[PDB]
Design an enzyme around this catalytic site. Structure first.
Site, PDB file in Angstrom:
ATOM      1  N   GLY A 196       0.784  -1.219   0.000  1.00 52.95           N
ATOM      2  CA  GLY A 196       0.000   0.000   0.000  1.00 52.95           C
ATOM      3  C   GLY A 196       0.820   1.275   0.000  1.00 52.95           C
ATOM      4  CB  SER A 198       3.311   0.350  -4.258  1.00 53.72           C
ATOM      5  OG  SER A 198       3.915  -0.845  -3.807  1.00 53.72           O
TER       6      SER A 198
HETATM    7  N1  LIG Z   1       9.944  -2.109   1.655  1.00 50.66           N
HETATM    8  C1  LIG Z   1       9.590  -3.390   1.625  1.00 50.66           C
HETATM    9  N2  LIG Z   1      10.249  -4.211   2.314  1.00 50.66           N
HETATM   10  N3  LIG Z   1       8.576  -3.836   0.874  1.00 50.66           N
HETATM   11  C2  LIG Z   1       7.806  -3.088   0.066  1.00 50.66           C
HETATM   12  O1  LIG Z   1       8.077  -1.969  -0.337  1.00 50.66           O
HETATM   13  C3  LIG Z   1       6.516  -3.689  -0.381  1.00 50.66           C
HETATM   14  N4  LIG Z   1       6.076  -4.801   0.237  1.00 50.66           N
HETATM   15  C4  LIG Z   1       4.911  -5.358  -0.143  1.00 50.66           C
HETATM   16  C5  LIG Z   1       4.480  -6.495   0.538  1.00 50.66           C
HETATM   17  C6  LIG Z   1       5.167  -7.126   1.590  1.00 50.66           C
HETATM   18  C7  LIG Z   1       4.333  -8.239   1.951  1.00 50.66           C
HETATM   19  C8  LIG Z   1       4.491  -9.220   2.921  1.00 50.66           C
HETATM   20  C9  LIG Z   1       3.501 -10.197   3.033  1.00 50.66           C
HETATM   21  C10 LIG Z   1       2.384 -10.187   2.192  1.00 50.66           C
HETATM   22  C11 LIG Z   1       2.239  -9.196   1.220  1.00 50.66           C
HETATM   23  C12 LIG Z   1       3.240  -8.238   1.137  1.00 50.66           C
HETATM   24  O2  LIG Z   1       3.319  -7.212   0.306  1.00 50.66           O
HETATM   25  C13 LIG Z   1       4.171  -4.799  -1.167  1.00 50.66           C
HETATM   26  N5  LIG Z   1       2.998  -5.354  -1.564  1.00 50.66           N
HETATM   27  N6  LIG Z   1       4.617  -3.690  -1.796  1.00 50.66           N
HETATM   28  C14 LIG Z   1       5.784  -3.127  -1.411  1.00 50.66           C
HETATM   29  N7  LIG Z   1       6.226  -2.013  -2.039  1.00 50.66           N
END
Ligand SMILES: N=C(N)NC(=O)c1nc(-c2cc3ccccc3o2)c(N)nc1N
Length: 245
Positions: A196, A198
């Protein structure tokens, strides 16, 4: 945003909140974005690639809460939705994850700058801060990876830029990270972007001014050891941005 602090739109007045209309009238949050000129918001292509029809989307500026109207906010239709033609994705990484939204109100206007609505400056070409520089990230994304809800109030936190050498180590991301991406994380891995967030801004101080250095793009989990946030490297896309705006 994992960790960090709650904030209001005055602190990040370029932040754009992007929603989608569903068949049946319901409206759900999609992603963040950043206002880079009165008529243009920049975001991430992966936010839109499933539903690439501009008529589905609503953009708010000056909005501090996810499901409540903020005094002074402005609401826009998407006149143009421009996705990067070289976008691609694997199981984890998104490449060329950058998108432009031209906004237009029901009466045909662009954004009116105010205390709660301002543009953010773009970086100079191929000019990023040094590694270890503290930058700010902002968004309505999850507060814990396991949460089902998004926070109602906007959040922001601080992460530090990581060198490309460090981020392409095998126990980090290997070659999934390219020179058109930037990595940033907390030294204790305790605060991070998440689902979210993003499309939203990574902002650093550059040449004495707040500058849009990155766009939230992807990561493995959130606030996980050796798994930084990965950001589209805005300073490597200036010809694309200038050409489509
Ligand atoms: N900075 C980070 N480490 N990650 C992200 O920036 C980021 N992480 C997710 C994400 C992590 C996650 C874990 C379990 C289930 C769904 C998930 O979705 C996402 N959908 N968009 C992103 N931009």
């Amino acid at each position: 945003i994992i960790g960090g602090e709650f904030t209001t739109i005055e602190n990040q007045p370029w932040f754009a909140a992007i929603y989608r209309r569903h068949r049946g009238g319901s409206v759900t949050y999609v992603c963040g974005g950043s206002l880079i000129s009165p008529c243009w918001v920049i975001s991430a292509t992966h936010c839109f690639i499933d539903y690439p029809k501009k008529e589905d989307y609503i953009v708010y500026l000056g909005r501090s809460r996810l499901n409540s109207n903020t005094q002074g906010e402005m609401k826009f239709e998407v006149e143009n939705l421009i996705l990067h033609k070289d976008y691609s994705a694997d199981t984890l990484a998104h490449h060329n994850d950058i998108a432009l939204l031209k906004i237009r109100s029901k009466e045909g206007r662009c954004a009116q700058p105010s205390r709660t609505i301002q543009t953010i400056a773009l970086p100079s070409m191929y000019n990023d801060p040094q590694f270890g520089t503290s930058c700010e990230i902002t968004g309505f994304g999850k507060e814990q990876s396991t949460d089902y809800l998004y926070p109602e109030q906007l959040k922001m936190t601080v992460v530090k830029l990581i060198s490309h050498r460090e981020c392409q180590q095998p126990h980090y991301y290997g070659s999934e990270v390219t020179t058109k991406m930037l990595c940033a994380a907390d030294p204790q891995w305790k605060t991070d972007s998440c689902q979210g967030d993003s499309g939203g801004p990574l902002v650093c101080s550059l040449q004495g001014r707040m500058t849009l250095t990155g766009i939230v793009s992807w990561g493995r989990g959130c606030a996980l050891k050796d798994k930084p946030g990965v950001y589209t490297r805005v300073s490597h896309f200036l010809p694309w941005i200038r050409s489509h705006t």
